[PDB]
Write a protein that binds this ligand. Structure first.
Ligand SMILES: Nc1ncnc2c1ncn2[C@@H]1O[C@H](COP(=O)(O)OP(=O)(O)NP(=O)(O)O)[C@@H](O)[C@H]1O
Ligand SMILES: O=C(O)C1=C[C@@H](O)[C@H](O)[C@H](O)C1
Length: 165
């Protein structure tokens, strides 16, 4: 079973905080978005364009159930994984950390285009605020620890978590 599992919106810090926490405990990192590209032929934007979001979600669920059984290090999840009811039932019993961020700082952190099919195009600030309103009740229901990332630098986030494990 993992030592910790990380969830939240794009730009909260899931990949950055996960690398740094794994180095301090002595263990490996597994990132489910990276695992998906390795197993199929292609990119995340390629699968969304040829096949659709509902077929992305079925591949993501099967990857997640297997990681929770076989991996003893730190695990980082994709941003919309909590919208599947089969993902929420596999998480019950596990150690789960929710990273919180405001809408104005969150949109400024995503600013140098990694891509992101669901944030693409004009009116970026309007689309980010609509994603927050519908997911926030879902992050609160799955969590066992909540941490505020608004005025904490990344080394100080790591130390707050380490003392509560
Ligand atoms: N506490 C922090 N303070 C200052 N900058 C930060 C903080 N956390 C993350 N960043 C920066 O914000 C950017 C995004 O962080 P990242 O770790 O990629 O988040 P993400 O939650 O994994 N995205 P996704 O899987 O696509 O939903 C990076 O350049 C980081 O360097
Ligand atoms: O639905 C989402 O919010 C996301 C889906 C994919 O682009 C990626 O899995 C990303 O982390 C965000």
């Amino acid at each position: 079973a993992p030592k910790a599992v990380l969830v939240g919106l794009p730009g909260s810090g899931k990949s950055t905080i996960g690398r740094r926490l794994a180095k301090a405990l002595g263990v490996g990192l597994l990132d489910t978005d990276v695992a998906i590209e390795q197993r199929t032929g292609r990119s995340i934007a390629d699968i969304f364009a040829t096949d659709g979001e509902q077929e992305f979600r079925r591949i993501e669920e099967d990857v997640v159930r297997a990681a929770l059984a076989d991996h003893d290090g730190v695990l980082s999840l994709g941003g919309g994984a909590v919208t599947s009811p089969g993902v929420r039932a596999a998480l019950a019993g596990h150690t789960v950390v929710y990273l919180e961020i405001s809408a104005a700082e969150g949109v400024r952190r995503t600013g140098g285009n990694t891509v992101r099919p669901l944030l693409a195009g004009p009116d970026r600030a309007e689309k980010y605020r609509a994603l927050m309103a519908k997911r926030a009740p879902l992050y609160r229901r799955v969590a066992t620890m909540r941490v505020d990332t608004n005025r904490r630098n990344p080394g100080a986030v790591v130390r707050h978590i380490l003392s509560r494990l």
